[PDB]
Each structure stands twice: as structure tokens, then as C-alpha cells.
Structure 1
Amino acid sequence: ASPFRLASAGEISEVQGILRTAGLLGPEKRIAYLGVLDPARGAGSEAEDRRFRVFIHDVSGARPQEVTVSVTNGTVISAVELDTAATGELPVLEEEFEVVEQLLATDERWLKALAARNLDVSKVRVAPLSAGVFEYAEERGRRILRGLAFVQDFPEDSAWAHPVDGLVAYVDVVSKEVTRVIDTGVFPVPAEHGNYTDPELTGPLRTTQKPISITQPEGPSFTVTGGNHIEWEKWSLDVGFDVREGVVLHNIAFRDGDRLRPIINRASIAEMVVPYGDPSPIRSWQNYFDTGEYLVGQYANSLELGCDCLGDITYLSPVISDAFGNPREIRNGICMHEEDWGILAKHSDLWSGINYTRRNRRMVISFFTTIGNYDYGFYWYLYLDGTIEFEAKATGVVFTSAFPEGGSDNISQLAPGLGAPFHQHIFSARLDMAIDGFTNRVEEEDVVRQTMGPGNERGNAFSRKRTVLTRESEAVREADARTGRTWIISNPESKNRLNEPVGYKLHAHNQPTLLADPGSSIARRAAFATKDLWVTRYADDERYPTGDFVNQHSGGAGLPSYIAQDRDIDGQDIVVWHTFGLTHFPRVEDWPIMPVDTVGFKLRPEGFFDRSPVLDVPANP
């Protein structure tokens, strides 16, 4: 059995039993995060040691613990008590989400604000949002959630169409207490509904769409062994699942001849952040770190056949832990299929008379998560030609507000009285690189303009330069689309047949990075998001670009702390962190449910192979 196998329902039960016995899994305890740790560097030969990391919360108010357990041996390995005013809170628990609306329902200041607006408290939904760190001194050390109100007219109604602006509450969901209710003014609650399944809003449905039928009469070309190890068209990898990061890709390698060559050791989306750009005091605190604060894999959808995934689909059903250590299955949470991808290569040669066409294919590994109004798809793509691509698909319902009658520079209007504040969705990809092994380096490649003159008499020449990043303090880079800037990850000790280092090139989309003022609270907590590319020396405890405890943590943790060590990264075991995201100015077409928008990155081989790696693909059947 592979040490990268998915966690089992049996293993989850053992961890719960090991913690119960040890006295750490009491009845006031809650598991806020559970995941299997990755093997340590070099210990592949040999012996299992399935270890698990656990964050234990305490509903009574006591301090939480970080705990590691070995289930192959059966004991606790370490247990540490946390000072959360110091290192940040544990991730939000599912059961804390509803405490906010239920508490607020009996608070007098909140009842008072709803009565001024003539709203039946039983029709008011409260969205519980992460709190962040701002000026309120009484919140440091406290578990705080903030709450924004929407009206549901009837149980099937889309509450997002009726925001209650000028109102926000803050809640302590350990001591069950409403610290503040802030009421800045009454805004009309917008009246139109946004019910996208109502025949009155959709009109008659189309009858013009005829079916597309995608089938594989002989089955798919990939194999799955061991639960999660994939072999497809010379590719080899392990598909992991963590409750925080979601789908994680391990040991990506390509069979070149009869060498299995490594490419990436671990690939994940290790954080994301959603900052809002509305300076109103009702919303100027809202930023979520979906991955670090909420854990995106916990909210993975179960994907339906023919609706979410089309074709010959193979599913994985990852197991996570509920808040008491009971195993929970996410049935059909990961989809895997191959997809036709047009023409791979084509040439008709006049001089030889040979007409040559080959078709491309990709294999797709995806999952989809839902946190409140947002829906995010995560797609990994492997292509025949050695390309690796990631794509994020953002859909769902926009987060809404009132539209102020004067208009706004930070909000757009979707419908009469209804606004959608400006925001970004920013991702951090963490790529633990292993280009032909662990001795890797990063070069930055710029196009070079040349001046007309001697050596370049017709002024037609142009070139490129590569700059090696040698220390971590040099390795915080920004994009430059105008110079065609890319980054090459190479192995200086592994050469192709032309005696050049083997390499992969990273092509970014060059979207804007974090827009918030550099002195803001969000620029401190989401330092990673202010630059396109960071490179660190690998270390087992440096896993997330924002640190281990994102909820209510001050700034600084994560990447700006790692790179301060100024370690050697020239031909070393390195990690590339790529920031990319969407800047979302909502448009009318985004309402009342939004069409998918996409962002991503890709890596293409750059002299990794000795010639095209797809000469052996056959003429199509």
C-alpha cells in the first residue's frame, strides 16, 4: 500500500479512538481540522508511518491543541496547547455558522434595527463571515464572527436578492455574546426577486438544444490502482485530498522511454483570499480566506453524472472527519475523465507529399466547493504534450448590498436598488518542484529589445535574457506582460541531449494582484497576494503562504517570514508559490446567478525532452 493513499474511514476511527483514550478528545472538544501528513523527505525506504495532524477546539473556552498521531503504531506523537491571541484562531466550525443568526434573533439591539425596517425576524437570514483583525481591542483572543443580514420572503426564495444594508453585527461564538450591533442608516431592501428557477423569471425554457453524447465504448485510457494512483498517457501521479486544500496532486511524473522522470513533487492551491473593495464601514472589513479560514474541501459538492461531469466518469469519494471524529464520506466528490482537445500537431508538406494530423487529449481532475453564495470549481489538466494547467471556475451568486441613490465608485448596480461591491478572488498555487529530481533552480526570462545599429543593421533582431534567482531574498518577483516575462524551473545537473539543463516554463495570465493599499490590514494578512511569484527553500513546516492559523491572525505569517531566512535556492530543493486571481467588477449579466469566469496558469516543457514527446501518438481510429 502506497503511503500517499487517501485517508480511510478506518484510519479516521483509529485517530478518534487514540485521542479519546489519551483524554484529548473529551466531550467538550471539537476536531476543527484533520488530515494525513506527507511522508518526510527521503524516508521512502521504508516502513509505513501514517501520521495525522489534528486541530482540537474547546467549546467551553479552554485553549485548543495541535496534535499529531501515528495510527500505524497507535499513539499520540505530540500535543501542544496554543495561545490563539498569539498564533491565530483555529478554522471556523460548521456548527458556529448558525449560532450567529440564532443568537442575533434574541438580541435587543438587533431586534430594534429590524423593527425600524419593518422586517419579521423570522425572515432574516444572517451570513456568518470571518472577522479579520481591525481596530477593536476587545476581539484579540476572542473567537469573533461578523454577520450581514438578508431577507428571505418564503423558504424557497433567494435571500441574496434582498440585502439589509447599513446593518452589521459582531458575535463571539464561544461565550455566545453579541459584542456590537452597528446601524449606520436605513436602506430600502431591494424588492425584485432573484429566483432563477421561477418560470416567471426564466420565461419558457429552450427546446432548441439537442443532446451531445460523449462515450468511451471501450472504457477510459487511464488506470487507477491503490485507490488513487493514476497512470495516463505516460503520466504518473497520486490524487490526494485534504480537508483544507481540497484535491492535492502528488508525485507528478512522466515516463520518458523507460525512465519515470519526476516533474512536481506536490501541487496544491494552498490558500485563497476574497477581498472586497467597498469602503463603507458596513463592509470594509470583509475579506475571507476560504482555504485557511473555512477549509474548502469540507464543503465539496457531490458531483452528478451528466450534469456536473459528462462522459465516461470515474469518481473518488474522499473521507474526512466530522467535528467528533466520525468518518464522513463525500460521495462522488472528485471527477476524473479524459477529454478530446482538438488538434495536437498538423502539417501538410508540399515537398514530401505527407499529410499528418494528430489529435490532442487532456485528463481532467476536478472538484467543486460551495461556501455561502460562492461556488468554486478547481480543475487540473494534464495534456499529451507534457503541459500541466490549472483552472479555477468561479460561479454562484454575487454578494450584494444596497445601491446608493447617488451611485458609487466601488459598487455596481445589478437591478433597481441592488448593488454588488467590487472584489477580487485570489489564489496561491504551491508547487513543490521536482524537475528530474530535487536539485532545481528558477530563472526569470524577459524578452530583450535590440537597437538598430552595428551587428543589427536592419533593426530586426530581438533576444531574451534569463536571470537566476539564487537566494530567497531575491525571489519575490512581479509580472511584466509587456516583456513577455515567464519563469523557468530547471535542473542544472540533468541535461538533455543538446547538453542544456532540462526545464519547465511557467506561463502566468498576468492579472492584477492585490489592489488594497499596502498599509491595509488585508495587505499584511495576505502578503502573498501582493506579488506574482515567490520561491522558497523547501521545509516540512512551511506549508501555507499565510501560516497554519489564518483566522484572526495578525499579518506577517507565512511567506514574508519564510523568505527572511534568505536561504540558498540555486540548485536546491525548492518550492514555487504563484499568485493569480480575478478582479471582479460585477456586471448585469452576473445577476441573478452568474456565468462561470476563469483564471489559471500553466507549465510547459522547455527542453525537458530530447524532441517532441508525442511522436508515438497514433493516427486516429
Structure 2
Amino acid sequence: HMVPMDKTLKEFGADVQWDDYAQLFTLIKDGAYVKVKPGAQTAIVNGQPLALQVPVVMKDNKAWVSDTFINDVFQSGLDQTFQVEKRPHPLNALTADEIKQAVEIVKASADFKPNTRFTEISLLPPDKEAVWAFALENKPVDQPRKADVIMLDGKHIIEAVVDLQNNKLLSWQPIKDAHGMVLLDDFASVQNIINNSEEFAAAVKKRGITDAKKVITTPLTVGYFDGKDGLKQDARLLKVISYLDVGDGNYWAHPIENLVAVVDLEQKKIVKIEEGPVVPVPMTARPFDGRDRVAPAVKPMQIIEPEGKNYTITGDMIHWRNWDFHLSMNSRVGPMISTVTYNDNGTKRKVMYEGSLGGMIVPYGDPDIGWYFKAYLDSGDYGMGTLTSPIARGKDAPSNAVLLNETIADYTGVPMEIPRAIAVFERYAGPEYKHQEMGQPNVSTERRELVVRWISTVGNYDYIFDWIFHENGTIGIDAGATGIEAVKGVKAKTMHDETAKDDTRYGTLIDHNIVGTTHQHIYNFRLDLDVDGENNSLVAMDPVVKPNTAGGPRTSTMQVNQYNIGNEQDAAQKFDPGTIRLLSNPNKENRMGNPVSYQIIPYAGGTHPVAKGAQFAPDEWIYHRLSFMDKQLWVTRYHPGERFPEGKYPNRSTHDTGLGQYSKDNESLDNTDAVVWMTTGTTHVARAEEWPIMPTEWVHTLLKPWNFFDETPTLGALKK
């Protein structure tokens, strides 16, 4: 039973290359690199031969394979990239069966209602000491698997915990005053309410729009202004910004400016329409998908690993050179990198118990009615894991990547498999080191980094996060922003028009009648580092110039001021990239008697201007509610319920329940389990080069071993 090779392999997602001269197919998918010649009775998988009962058949310039070829070859076992897990790792995300089970358990309570949605359903993390003992000592974890089930009953939040091992409900706790995140049905529900509104349709009509049905809405959280926005605190509201759909596939380029509808989600209707002056909708077609463009010729470039990968993925555990870590997915914050150790000549040393995105904010700077409340808390308010964007193979990640699928719960409690959710790829990153001693043979080696990449898209923005494992012990965390700008419709076509100056007070004129409103992107990473153990202290080293007191001709020297930062409050600080901040283990030293440490660099560079803080006066509410915006480094005592820089329920919050809260009591950071939070952002002033689609802009952070090792870590195994 034959089938067409090319089409079948495409649909399966493999790259297919035919070489007419060699009469050879090269097939690539993930860890598998395959060669097969027509009519041969063996194929080659990752350097290894594989018998085929049925050879690839060529007929009138067209190849056919049996209908088991794909299984026979790709799933053969000669691709050793993925191996099966002997014992389930206690941090493995909830499975589909577990998700479904947690949903049946809460549904078995008399309180559940058919309207009830699920904001998040997630493994309730077992305790940290036991997870480490499993990872390093292989001790089983005897506490039962549990799940947190956070439910939205209309507008009310209930937190339920379930015990999955015993199929029982353990708790059911209403959470007073909390608003829940925006869920996928809210989007449809907002578009509908607008569509059924005669008022809104009339509002839209006096603004030029002739077919209201062509109006695309989008939902935003409203924030909190202690009543100045004229909106009651206890109702579930979203505001709604509108665009005209013109057929160019880019409604974002056709704002209907100065029209905002406020929607009550429980009443399912528009409770308020704010209207400002009428600004003609920008109408010119501005497609970003290529439809109006020539595709030039590019010569091929391929990164190939024809004997397979250097990493192994066992269940969710990834092993690579001296690294080992566990990689799992959460609907709110995306990827979670756990139990990170570095194998030092046989002994696994702890580096990081858990790293992930903490949260992020994208606040705007324009005071007008369509803008003044605008601040996306992408992970907290919209669920970034849920909104993961599948990796476009070979483009969003390099041709030598392996692409993992991940499973989370959707908002109605049903398992949802996200295809191509995370990319894993090894990459050449220049020379690791080099020395060309004059007159001698050179010495160079290559640097390899292992990257874990995840992309999440929220409305018009697309965010890329890379977790970068350097062979030498360094860890990089880089965030990339691309997508389509939020723009303001204005009257000016050029800076020569009479409204230009007023139109561009809060952003740049990037197209006719279009202004890229100025805003910030502020990312924060929650890094629970256990530098060769949990008992750590925070140390400062500030390079300084000191008068020379040692004699000789110099008036000055270069010296260091070294001091411990002994509490959370002093640890909350700006980052001066001219200084050194360490997380040290005061109980373990390297061979020179120096405390083993990691150097924490929240700002290692970026391609947009850098945000030195929040661009908000200190008396703005958004400033008040979100203290993480204003410092680049925080350190707090470990605590399993403190995970979000912006707080657990940030929608319409009135005070800081995040890093402000976690550090308010100013506890001791002396020789104890610490969690490091790095804030890094950009201040984005727009330019025409970014319209209609924005070229990816990057910021870089770094964690470097500092006297953690005794010598150059990549030198190699000692031969004597």
C-alpha cells in the first residue's frame, strides 16, 4: 500500500531534500537525520543503517513509500534523542488524564456551576527538599501528587486543591475581592456584545465607519484609578478598543481613534462608551504577510547534525554536557526550568532550583481616552503559556532544532496539546577561548550554547524567551519582542501638517495618520538559585577608584568595596552594570578559599533604549500597584507561594501583592534560601522602520559562575 513520499513527509513535518546527481533523499525532522536512495533496501538514520522491507519507489519522477515508512524510520530507535523515563519526575506537569481527573473532582462538589471556568489548573508543587532528594539522591517523593484548580465562578475566584493519588478534594476557598484573568471566551463575548449594540454602531457610524460588521474589537484590562475612571471596583469589566477591517489582514493598522467601550462581562453588555474627537480611520492597505511583495531568491543555508544531537531528553529531563535540568510548561508563565545542576567532575552541583518568567508589563505613556489605562500584564492578565505560538520550524528557530509539544489545561478544563511549543537547539557561538602565542601553534576551541526557546503572542505583540545554557556554566536569559505596534490614529500625514506636533507628543509618526505610541516593555524573571546549596548570601562588589597610598607615581588605584546586603529591602535596588552583585554560598569555597558564587546581571544589554525604571510619576496608581517596574534586582526569602512579581491576582488590584508584598517585612537574607528576581526592560520610541511589522528587538541578562569553579571550566578532563 504505497503513498506519495513528498506530500506525506510534508504533512508529518519533515524537511525533504532530493539530490538528483546523487539520487539521494535527505530527510530531516527534529533529532532524526535520514538518507535514503530509491530502490535501496537500507536507509541511514543518524549514521546507522536500517533495513527497509519496502524500498522507496521512484515512478515518472515521483517517489512513493509504504504507509509504514514514516513510523518505521522516524520512530525506529536509531534516533536516540528522546528516551523514556524510568521513574516519573515529581515536577512533571499534569498529564491530560490528570487534568481531566482534577476537573471531575471539583465537578463532584455541589458548588460547581456550568458557567464555572478554569483560569489555571497546575501541579501543586511538591516540597523543594524532596524534589532535590529525588533529583540528586533518587529518593522517592511520598507526598501525593496534587493539583491547584483556580476557578472563575462568573466573576469570583475560588481556589481549590485536589489530591490526585486519592481522587479526593482537599479544599475549596473563595478569594475575596480578587478578579480573575481574561479568558478566551471573553474575547468572543466582547465582539458579540459590540455587534449587538445599536449605540456602539451609531457611535461607530458618525466616525465614518459605514459597515459596523467590519469592526474588530480587542479586550483590555482597565486597571485601577481609585474611581477617577468612573468604574466600580467590584464588577468584572474590560475595555474595548476598535479597528476597521479593510481586507489587508492587518486590522491593527486601522484604529478607530477616541472610541472606547467598557464591557460588563456578567451583565453581558456595554455599560459605558467614552468618546473623544473624530479622527478619520487610516485606510491604506498595510499587509505584513507578503501578499503585495516580491519574494527574492535566497540560497539555502542549513545547520545539520547528521549523527543526532548532543543532548538527550528523557521524559522532560534534558541532559547536555555537564548540565542537567527539567523542563515543563505552565499556562500562566510558560516554561519552567527546574533542578538545574552542573556536573563537576562527577559531582552534580546545584545551581538553580527553579527559573521561569515571573511576569511582565507593557505600559503606555499617552493620557488620551484610548490609552491612559493601557498596560498589558501579559502573563498575569492573559495567560502566556496558554497563548503559546507554535514554532515555525526553521524560521522562528534554526533548522537544527528539536521542537517539543506541551500539554496544558484550557479554560473549560479540557487538555490542550500545543504543537511545537518549545524549541531546543545547540548552537555555535564563536570561540570559547583562544590564545595565539606569537610563534607557537594556535589554541582555539568552539563555544556551544544550548538554547531553550518559547514564543508567546498576546494580541498584537509576539514575545520570544531564550534560556541559554553555556557549556562553561554561564546561563543567559534573553527576551525578544516583535509583532505589530499599537498605533494611534491621528490627522497628520507628515511632520509638516499642522497637527503634527500635538499628534506626536507621545510618540513618533511612523506612517500617514499613524503614530506609534511610546511605551515600555518590562520583563521580570523569578530565579530561585541554590548556589551549590540553598543557604546563600547576597554580596556586593563595587569597583572604585581609591587614592594611592602605596607610593610611586600613581595618584589612584582600582579597588573593590565589598559588603553583604543583609535584608530584602536593601536587596531591592537599581542595577548599575558597573558593579558586581553575587549570590554566594558562605558555607562552600573554591580551591582559593573564595565563596562559590553566581554573578547576577539583570542588564547585559539590549537593542532598544533601556528602561532605567518605570516611566511614571511616583503618584500614578499603576506605579503604586506595580513596584517591580522600578528596580532591576530583588532578592527575597524562599517561599513557595511567592511566584509573581505583579502579584497573583493583578486584574484591578488596588495595592502591590507582588514584589512589594514579598519584601515588605524586610526579612533577613543572611545565609538562607533566596529567590532572585531580575527586572529588565526597554523604552520603546517608535520609528518607521518598525511599521507595518516590527523587527525583533532583544534584551540580554546573565548569570555567571564567580569562583564557583577552580579553573577555566571548559579546559577538559585531567589526563593525570
TM-score, length basis structure 2: 0.82
Mapped contact 2:246–2:283 kept (Cα < 8 A): no
Mapped contact 2:424–2:450 kept (Cα < 8 A): yes
- Residue 548 of structure 1 pairs with residue 639 of structure 2: no
Aligned to 2:50: none
Q: Quick one: which of 646, 657, 663 aligns to 1:563?
A: 663
Q: Quick one: which of 224, 230, 237 aligns to 1:133?
A: 224
Mapped contact 1:486–1:508 kept (Cα < 8 A): no
Structure 2 CA distance for partners of 1:24 and 1:363, relative to 1, 3 Å: farther
Structure 2 CA distance for partners of 1:14 and 1:199, relative to 1, 3 Å: closer
Mapped contact 1:358–1:617 kept (Cα < 8 A): no
Q: Quick one: which of 499, 505, 508 aligns to 1:409?
A: 505
Return the offset for 1:64: 2.7
Unpaired runs of 5+ residues, structure 2, are 1-87, 132-138, 492-498, 605-609
Return the offset for 1:90: 1.1
| Helix, strand or coil at the partner of 1:296 | coil
Return the offset for 1:198: 4.9
**Alignment of structure 1 residues 57-76 onto 2, 5 Å:** 57-59=152-154, 63-76=156-169
Structure 2 CA distance for partners of 1:459 and 1:166, relative to 1, 3 Å: same
| In 2, Cα distance between equivalents of 1:401 and 1:434 | 46
Mapped contact 1:424–1:581 kept (Cα < 8 A): yes
Amino acid at match of 1:406: A
Return the offset for 1:452: 5.0
| Helix, strand or coil at the partner of 2:166 | coil
Q: Which 10-residue stretch deviates more, 415-424 or 548-557? A: 548-557
Aligned to 1:3: 90
Q: Quick one: which of 514, 518, 530 aligns to 1:434?
A: 530
**Alignment of structure 1 residues 284-295 onto 2, 5 Å:** 284-295=372-383
Aligned to 2:134: none
| In 1, Cα distance between equivalents of 2:484 and 2:254 | 12
- Residue 524 of structure 1 pairs with residue 624 of structure 2: yes
Q: Quick one: which of 191, 214, 218 aligns to 1:123?
A: 214
| In 1, Cα distance between equivalents of 2:369 and 2:109 | 46
* Structure whose CA Rg is larger: 2
Aligned to 2:613: 513
| In 2, Cα distance between equivalents of 1:443 and 1:409 | 43
Mapped contact 1:318–1:331 kept (Cα < 8 A): yes
Return the offset for 1:33: 1.2
Mapped contact 1:18–1:74 kept (Cα < 8 A): yes
Aligned to 2:49: none
| Helix, strand or coil at the partner of 1:17 | helix
**Alignment of structure 1 residues 181-580 onto 2, 5 Å:** 181-200=273-292, 202=293, 204-207=294-297, 209-225=298-314, 227-350=315-438, 353-404=440-491, 405-407=499-501, 408-451=504-547, 455=551, 457-459=553-555, 461-481=557-577, 484-509=578-603, 511=610, 512-580=612-680
Q: Which 10-residue stretch deviates more, 556-565 or 446-455? A: 446-455
Mapped contact 1:166–1:282 kept (Cα < 8 A): yes
Q: Quick one: which of 56, 79, 83 aligns to 2:151?
A: 56
Return the offset for 1:375: 0.5
| In 2, Cα distance between equivalents of 1:477 and 1:183 | 41
Mapped contact 1:273–1:526 kept (Cα < 8 A): no
- Residue 38 of structure 1 pairs with residue 125 of structure 2: yes
Amino acid at match of 1:211: P
Mapped contact 2:386–2:410 kept (Cα < 8 A): no
| In 2, Cα distance between equivalents of 1:306 and 1:107 | 45
Aligned to 1:100: 190
| In 2, Cα distance between equivalents of 1:585 and 1:136 | 27
| In 2, Cα distance between equivalents of 1:265 and 1:217 | 34
Return the offset for 1:453: 5.8
Deviations 1:334-384 (A, max 9, x none): 111111111001112237x34211000000111111111111111110011
| Helix, strand or coil at the partner of 2:535 | coil
Mapped contact 1:190–1:418 kept (Cα < 8 A): yes
Deviations 1:449-503 (A, max 9, x none): 123565463135211222211122221111224xx12311110001111111000
- Residue 178 of structure 1 pairs with residue 270 of structure 2: yes
Structure 2 CA distance for partners of 1:232 and 1:25, relative to 1, 3 Å: farther
Deviations 1:297-344 (A, max 9, x none): 000012132232223332321111122211110011111111111100
Aligned to 2:99: 12
Mapped contact 2:93–2:122 kept (Cα < 8 A): no
Q: Quick one: which of 239, 245, 261 aligns to 1:152?
A: 245
TM-score, length basis structure 1: 0.94
| In 1, Cα distance between equivalents of 2:705 and 2:192 | 54
Mapped contact 1:220–1:312 kept (Cα < 8 A): no
Structure 2 CA distance for partners of 1:258 and 1:410, relative to 1, 3 Å: same
| Helix, strand or coil at the partner of 1:435 | coil
Return the offset for 1:24: 4.7
| In 2, Cα distance between equivalents of 1:364 and 1:535 | 26
Return the offset for 1:508: 2.9
Amino acid at match of 1:142: A
Mapped contact 2:597–2:707 kept (Cα < 8 A): yes
Return the offset for 1:137: 5.1
| In 2, Cα distance between equivalents of 1:215 and 1:460 | 53
| In 2, Cα distance between equivalents of 1:472 and 1:416 | 49
Aligned CA RMSD, in angstroms, stands at 1.7
Amino acid at match of 1:271: G
Amino acid at match of 1:598: W
| In 2, Cα distance between equivalents of 1:451 and 1:112 | 74
Aligned to 2:681: 581
Unpaired runs of 5+ residues, structure 1, are none
| In 1, Cα distance between equivalents of 2:234 and 2:241 | 22
Mapped contact 2:208–2:280 kept (Cα < 8 A): no
Percent identity, please. Answer: 29
Deviations 1:489-530 (A, max 9, x none): 110001111111000111232732211111101112211111
| In 2, Cα distance between equivalents of 1:16 and 1:487 | 45
| In 1, Cα distance between equivalents of 2:420 and 2:359 | 24
Mapped contact 1:240–1:248 kept (Cα < 8 A): yes
Return the offset for 1:179: 1.6
Structure scoring higher RCO (CA < 8 A, sep ≥ 6) equals 1
| In 1, Cα distance between equivalents of 2:110 and 2:286 | 50
Amino acid at match of 1:186: V
| Helix, strand or coil at the partner of 2:708 | coil
Mapped contact 1:315–1:332 kept (Cα < 8 A): yes
| In 2, Cα distance between equivalents of 1:251 and 1:327 | 26
Aligned to 1:142: 235
Amino acid at match of 2:147: F
| Helix, strand or coil at the partner of 1:43 | helix
Mapped contact 1:16–1:25 kept (Cα < 8 A): no
Amino acid at match of 1:488: L
Aligned to 1:22: 109
Structure 2 CA distance for partners of 1:356 and 1:159, relative to 1, 3 Å: same
Mapped contact 1:216–1:311 kept (Cα < 8 A): no
- Residue 163 of structure 1 pairs with residue 259 of structure 2: no
Amino acid at match of 1:174: E
